[PDB]
Amino acid sequence: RITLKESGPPLVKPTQTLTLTCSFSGFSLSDFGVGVGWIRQPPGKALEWLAIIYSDDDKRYSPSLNTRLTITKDTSKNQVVLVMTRVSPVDTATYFCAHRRGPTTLFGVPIARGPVNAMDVWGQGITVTISSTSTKGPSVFPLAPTAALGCLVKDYFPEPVTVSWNSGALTSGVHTFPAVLQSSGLYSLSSVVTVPSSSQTYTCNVNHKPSNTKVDKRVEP
Amino acid sequence: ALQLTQSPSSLSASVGDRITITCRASQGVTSALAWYRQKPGSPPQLLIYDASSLESGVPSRFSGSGSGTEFTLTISTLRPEDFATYYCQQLHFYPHTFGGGTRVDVRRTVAAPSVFIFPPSDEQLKSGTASVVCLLNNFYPREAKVQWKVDNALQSGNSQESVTEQDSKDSTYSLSSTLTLSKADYEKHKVYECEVTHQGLSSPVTKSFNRGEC
Amino acid sequence: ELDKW
């Protein structure tokens, strides 16, 4: 069985260097034609190919990222490393490393080359965020007027943050939206709940453990 | 570089359906093409390699065909685990291009979004910032457009969106859009508008308020 | 540029 796993820092500040490590097992980078590639995925976006390195130390990079990437391998400790110099928030993404099969070899020979046409095994992936920002608790604001309603959980860092309504009793009609990383390097998120304009009190239970920021927020029209 | 356009971007389907996704290259990529399925939270999983070769372990309901510039992925009988996003990858040229992806969600009846506009709290305004939030609740399909207008001026570059994951019970999506201005700026206008365009709406619905009007 | 294989 083949496995790959990404390791590195979850946070990096702009202008800094990001060093990602891909530790694998089940194959060697001394094995014929084998390659290990890196692919990232910004939150909510498509896959973007970054680079690949093969057992013969052959290297290829993304043309648009070339000046900032360096890929390398340590055959002895099954590790492929990716160095990304001077990052910006756009570099924020999930980074995957993946295995690429080499050609099928029969005794001496390569009878088959179709298996190289894919990255057959991927690692879980590592999430990296780029912010010059420091740990910070959110400011909770009310969102007031079937009727809608909610809390604006704003300017916190880093992820994540928990949002509950009425200490967990209210769950139906709730929508806690995924957070957006603001140009400020802080996250902002909203949790809303729809109900029968007839009604019952509504309170947001907001908790951002990193900052130890805990907030209860009653919301009325 | 080389262009990998997927069709369609989003696809509505139900269990048991036969679906096909296509990946189109700007230049021939021979048979050097791979298809992957990605479930939220997980990494892409190889389904097809070399345009048609079925990867070991992958269910026979997955099938790939085509060569050159036209490639198709076929899932003969959709199972629950196929509600995911699919990607194609080209490995004939460097860089090894990936397509934009094809989201496959649970099909349901069309449902227009309940729109709601929230003005900024005075509590926030005191801090020097004004966030206007627009909410598009339980709609379908997942494809919606939100256009902010301030005193009829079109807003651009000052809003961020966020969509929920299809509801496991509703099969609907919900969208949050936040228009952010400075307090000074916010107080220089009166009509804050959220225009919503969506398939379940004959024409765009607009929700607004007049800053002030008490 | 062409792929390795």
The verdict on B2 touching C (C-beta cutoff 8 Å) is no
Which chain A residues contact residue B33 at CB under 8 A? 117
Contact B49 A122 (CB under 8 A): no
Contact residues for A13 (Cβ-Cβ < 8 A; gap 6+): A130, A131, A132
The verdict on A128 and A26 lying in the same domain is yes
Q: Does B101 touch chain A (CB under 8 A)?
A: yes
Distance CA(A128)–CA(A208), nearest Å, equals 19
Residues A124 and A137 reside in one and the same domain: no
Same domain? For A144 and A88 the reply is no
Helix (H) or strand (E) holding B135: strand B129-139
CATH assignment at residue A21: 2.60.40.10
Best C1, C3, C5 residue to mutate vs chain B (most B CBs within 10 Å): C3
Give me the amino acid identity at A219: V
Which pair of tokens denotes residue B180?
């952010």
Q: Which of A132, A166, A182 is the last residue of a domain?
A: A132
Neighbours of chain C (3+ CB pairs under 8 A): A, B
HEC secondary structure over A143-184: ECCCECCEEEEEEEECCCCEEEEHHHCECCCEEECCCEECCC
Superfamily covering domain B108-211? Immunoglobulins (2.60.40.10)
Is A48 within 8 Å of chain B by CB?
yes
Whether B93 contacts chain C with CB within 8 A = yes
CA distance A207 to A215: 6
Technique employed here was X-ray
User: If you count residue pairs, one on B and one on C, with CB atoms under 8 Å apart, how many are there?
Assistant: 11
The number of domains in chain A is 2
| A160 in the same domain as A71 | no
Q: Domain extents for chain B?
A: 1-107, 108-211
The DSSP letter of residue B155 is P
For A188, the domain range is 133-221
The helix/strand/coil state of B125 is: helix
Within this chain, do residues A93 and A189 fall inside the same structural domain, yes or no?
A: no
Position B109: which residue type? T
Please enumerate in sequence order all residues whose Cβ is within 8 A of that of B84, keeping only pairs 6 or more positions apart, or say none: B37, B38, B39, B40, B103, B104
In terms of phi and psi (left: phi > 0; alpha: psi -120 to 50; beta: otherwise), the region of A108 is alpha
Contact C1 B96 (CB under 8 A): no
Query: What resolution does the deposited structure have, in angstroms?
Result: 2.5
Shared domain for A83 and A71, answered yes or no, is yes
Q: What is residue B142's DSSP assignment?
A: S
Residues A6 and A104 both lie in one domain: yes
CB contact under 8 A, B46 and A118: yes
Of the residues A69, A98, A132, the one at which a domain ends = A132
d(CA B20, CA B69): 16
Q: Do A128 and A149 belong together in one domain?
A: no
Class of domain B1-107: mainly beta
Domains B1-107 and B108-211 share a fold: yes
Shared domain for A86 and A169, answered yes or no, is no
Pairing of strands A150-156, A162-165: unpaired
Please indicate, yes or no, whether residues A207 and A140 belong to a single structural domain of this protein: yes
Which is it for the CA torsion B152, B156, B158, B162, positive or negative?
positive
Choosing from A105, A132, A159, the residue where a domain stops is: A132
The DSSP result for A48-89, as a single string, is: EEEEEEETT--EEE-TTTGGGEEEEEEGGGTEEEEEE-S--G
Scanning C1-5 for CB atoms below 8 A from A yields 1, 3-5
Is any Cβ of chain C less than 8 angstroms from the Cβ of B94?
A: yes
A149 and A109 in one domain?
no
